[PDB]
Design a protein around this ligand. Structure first.
Ligand SMILES: Nc1nc2c(ncn2[C@@H]2O[C@H](COP(=O)(O)OP(=O)(O)NP(=O)(O)O)[C@@H](O)[C@H]2O)c(=O)[nH]1
Ligand SMILES: [Cl-]
Ligand SMILES: [Mg+2]
Length: 294
């Protein structure tokens, strides 16, 4: 922990010539990556990995050049990208992350203005000509098909009948659906309320973590806004945002979300196979049983 910070302080000062670290603390952390707050002013995201930060950096650059908006996003001042190590540094966007608790304290009018701000942001981003980042495409259906092939080549035959049926029933739905055939555009693609920042009037002031962004189905950016869970605000919130956003089939957006949710245990298994992490394989398989029995 105090050791973790030291290594990273060392790396930051080694790769960024005149940068002096006076303070550094961990502010966020997954199984792939760690984020640090440095000098109480800079966020540094770091990853020991093509699975690095080149695309994410290209997207910040494209967005900072082409969006016209008052909503802040990361603006990369420092970067180091190699095969084994990636670092992005940018000034911290100040604010309070949106949560369900906070939303519930807001007045009706505050909630509306927040929704309108979100809809506006998404409309502007989805309307950009993405020619200049055209290499950042993501085909979710094809990705799933390839992940299924990887399953068939590795552990599929050791799975139980219940697990196999869950997977085959998902593949059948994937084959019948039309929700991947609509408009493609640049999406944030991890658009949950823990990535939305509010200012002191409860208005949207910033958006972070475009680390999964790319050119993908328009429906992608409504997946968490439509989610019913403890972490997200609720389906009505997403529905209202969709009405404000306009010119989009809401029932398809919901079908897209439902499909991505059904995929989740399989995505988890596949993550464990690819990263040689048995814990994830086991968790995904257990989750299939939990869903089958509800
Ligand atoms: N206030 C503030 N916090 C930030 C900012 N950038 C990152 N953070 C904090 O650092 C955490 C990690 O940043 P994030 O980009 O989401 O990292 P990640 O590796 O992509 N995590 P994940 O993909 O799992 O959401 C965020 O959850 C948030 O707590 C920022 O500009 N402002
Ligand atoms: Cl297992
Ligand atoms: Mg991220």
């Amino acid at each position: 922990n105090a050791t973790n910070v030291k290594a990273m302080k060392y790396l930051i000062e080694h790769y960024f010539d005149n940068f002096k670290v006076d303070s550094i603390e961990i502010i966020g952390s997954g199984y792939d990556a760690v984020a640090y707050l440095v000098n109480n002013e800079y966020i540094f995201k770091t990853k020991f990995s093509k699975k690095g930060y080149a695309k994410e950096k290209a997207i910040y650059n494209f967005l900072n050049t082409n969006l016209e908006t008052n909503v802040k996003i990361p603006n990369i001042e420092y970067s180091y990208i190699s095969d084994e190590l990636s670092i992005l540094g940018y000034k911290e966007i100040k604010g309070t992350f949106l949560t369900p608790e906070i939303y519930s304290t807001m007045s009706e009018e505050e909630q509306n203005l927040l929704k309108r701000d979100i809809a506006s942001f998404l409309r502007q981003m989805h309307g950009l000509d993405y020619t200049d980042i055209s290499e950042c495409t993501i085909d979710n259906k094809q990705n799933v098909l390839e992940e299924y092939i990887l399953l068939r080549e590795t552990i599929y035959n050791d799975l139980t009948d219940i697990e196999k049926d869950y997977i085959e029933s998902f593949m059948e739905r994937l084959n019948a659906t039309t929700v991947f055939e609509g408009k493609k555009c640049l999406c944030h693609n991890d658009f949950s309320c823990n990535h939305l920042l509010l200012d002191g009037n409860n208005r949207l002031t910033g958006i972070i973590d475009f680390g999964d962004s790319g050119i993908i189905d328009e429906y992608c950016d409504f997946i968490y806004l439509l989610e019913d869970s403890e972490e997200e605000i609720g389906t009505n919130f997403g529905e209202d945002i969709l009405r404000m956003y306009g010119n989009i089939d809401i029932e398809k957006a919901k079908e897209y979300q439902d499909i991505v949710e059904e995929y989740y245990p399989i995505e988890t298994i596949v993550y464990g196979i690819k990263n040689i992490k048995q814990e994830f394989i086991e968790n995904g398989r257990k989750e299939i049983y939990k869903r089958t029995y509800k």
